[PDB]
């Protein structure tokens, strides 16, 4: 129910392809001039976008009649897919555990005296993944109120069962697009291991200058005895290489494809190591492509259900399509990500045990990896929060709880990238607890 | 024991992906907007 | 090169509101402002922005 | 030179090592390529780049 409609709807004109040029040519558009209906084409031929009523141009008042009425349909699917990990029924988080390796002690005789019956807890990370997405799409079909738009059966199957694909498509597209923000959350949280590839310090010739990092680094991930530095958690873990994969912007893949893969008289030397999984990019900035093992995706299903109603008073159906999931990210497993722009020098600081139970008067060791990119060794300062007067921590990250708190304790370990200004912290954060001391009470000395 | 904490623990982070994908009707992070329950996701799914 | 403002056709009540969501097309690496507007109104309705 | 600097320095760096490495595995071994300067030899398999 329209009126004053423009037919120049969305258009802006970069040139008007007629009155700036094809009528006052002398150049390349020349070729156009022997044509000459090529203003009705120029004003209706990129499509209509309002329908107007358009009468006939030998006898008015006839209407032209729309008379050809094609209905596109695509479908679309989640090549992440396959990294998905079954079902959770039953359940809402998930528990997992990892054990580490522990610091070598000097042999050493005389200190053993009395340290016989020692404790030493060994060094485990837990991480937790709670049940996130949990979400429904709602789609009407008034079956009464579309036989207006069409005058034939067969045109009104070949669209009503589109809208049931448009379910299928929406679930599957935001199963591609959630799954694509994890990766996008995780990087903007600086949990990524950041590697630069778009760098090359050398000379002229860095054609390969990716495909030699991304060779590197994908061999680095599945050294047998482990690397700390590619986890979030700083933990001893391992890759097998057959479990490495490859998520890349399809801008990417065609730089590794035709600077690399063309003049390759061996491509076994030069393909990506692991399997490659091309996107259309990611939302980050600068982010290139990430490697992570299979363990990184911590996706899991919960439901789906399609639900129907029937409207009897609107004469239509609801359809409900309920798609509840896990969506997580497991810390522990190697994730490297392949960045091109300038980023900062300190993305993580990963303080050690991450929680603790410190009784009253006790102590605790504290220990900060710093996850940096290029190594000015960027020096840590530890620092207490909600603490009082006694509990301080110092050095080498060392805290001391006093043996007059109850306060759950933030143990921070600052690093400053940044100058005089509002300046760069990198801080990680540690939550220690107390257990109450009895002890003896009153005063001293 | 532990009775009261945040869930961004320890996480810096460079830029915000809540004032990332609201506060940018732009581009780059318009395929996130239609996510409903995009909250919980990005400020859990870490872990 | 183009903006995208993708319903394309409303029929909203007398009262009632729309939500209406804007593709902008960057030939570069950049983010560009965009600003809503509502011409042939009433006094009053406003689209918010966004 | 560097085996990041150029293509050549890659490729001089892999002249120099078939070079030694048949030094090395050369019967007739030399008083070369050892710390004691022992007149030794060494063989193909025995070999770890």
Redesign the interface.
């Known amino acids: 129910?329209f009126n004053d409609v423009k037919t120049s709807?969305?258009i802006?004109e970069?040139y008007d392809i007629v009155n700036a040029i094809r009528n006052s040519q002398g150049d390349n558009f020349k070729s156009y001039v022997p044509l000459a209906t090529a203003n009705n084409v120029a004003e209706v031929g990129a499509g209509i976008?309002?329908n107007q009523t358009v009468q006939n141009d030998f006898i008015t008042s006839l209407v032209d009649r729309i008379g050809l009425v094609v209905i596109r349909q695509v479908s679309l699917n989640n090549p992440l897919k396959k990294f998905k990990k079954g079902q959770i029924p039953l359940g809402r988080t998930i528990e997992?555990i990892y054990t580490d390796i522990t610091k070598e002690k000097q042999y050493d005789a005389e200190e053993a005296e009395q340290k016989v019956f020692e404790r030493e807890m060994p060094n485990v990370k837990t991480?937790?993944?709670?049940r996130?997405?949990?979400?429904f799409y709602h789609q009407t079909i008034q079956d009464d109120s579309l036989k207006t738009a069409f005058v034939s059966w067969g045109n009104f199957e070949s669209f009503v069962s589109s809208i049931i694909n448009a379910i299928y498509n929406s679930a599957e597209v935001?199963e591609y697009?959630?799954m694509?923000?994890?990766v996008?959350?995780?990087y903007?949280?600086?949990?990524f291991t950041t590697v630069k590839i778009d760098e090359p310090?050398?000379?002229?010739?860095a054609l390969t200058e990716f495909v030699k990092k991304m060779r590197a680094t994908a061999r680095k991930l599945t050294l047998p005895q482990g690397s700390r530095d590619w986890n979030?958690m700083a933990v001893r873990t391992r890759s097998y290489m057959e479990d490495l994969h490859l998520i890349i912007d399809a801008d990417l893949e065609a730089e590794l494809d035709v600077d690399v893969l063309a003049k390759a008289f061996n491509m076994n030397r030069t393909d990506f190591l692991g399997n490659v999984t091309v996107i259309d990019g990611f939302?980050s900035?600068g982010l290139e492509a990430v490697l992570v093992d299979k363990d990184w995706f911590?996706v899991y299903d919960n439901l789906h259900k399609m639900e129907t109603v029937r409207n009897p008073r609107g004469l239509y159906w609801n359809y409900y399509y309920h798609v509840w999931q896990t969506?997580?990210?497991?810390?522990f497993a190697n994730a490297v990500a392949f960045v091109s722009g300038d980023v900062?020098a300190v993305?993580?600081?990963?303080?050690s045990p991450?929680?603790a139970?410190v009784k009253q008067g006790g102590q605790q060791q504290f220990t900060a990896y710093v996850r940096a990119t290029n190594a000015k060794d960027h020096k840590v300062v530890w620092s207490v929060e909600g603490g009082s007067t006694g509990t301080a921590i110092t050095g080498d990250g060392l805290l001391s709880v006093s043996g007059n708190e109850d306060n759950?304790l933030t143990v921070k370990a600052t690093v400053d990238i940044g100058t005089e200004d509002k300046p760069k912290?990198?801080?990680?954060?540690?939550?220690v607890?107390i257990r109450p001391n009895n002890a003896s009470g009153g005063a001293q000395a």
């Open positions: 129910t709807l969305g802006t970069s976008l309002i997992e991480l937790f993944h709670e996130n997405r949990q979400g935001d697009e959630y694509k923000l994890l996008d959350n995780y903007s949280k600086g949990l310090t050398s000379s002229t010739g979030s939302a900035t911590m969506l997580s990210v497991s810390r900062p993305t993580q600081v990963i303080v991450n929680i139970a759950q912290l990198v801080v990680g954060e540690a939550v607890s």
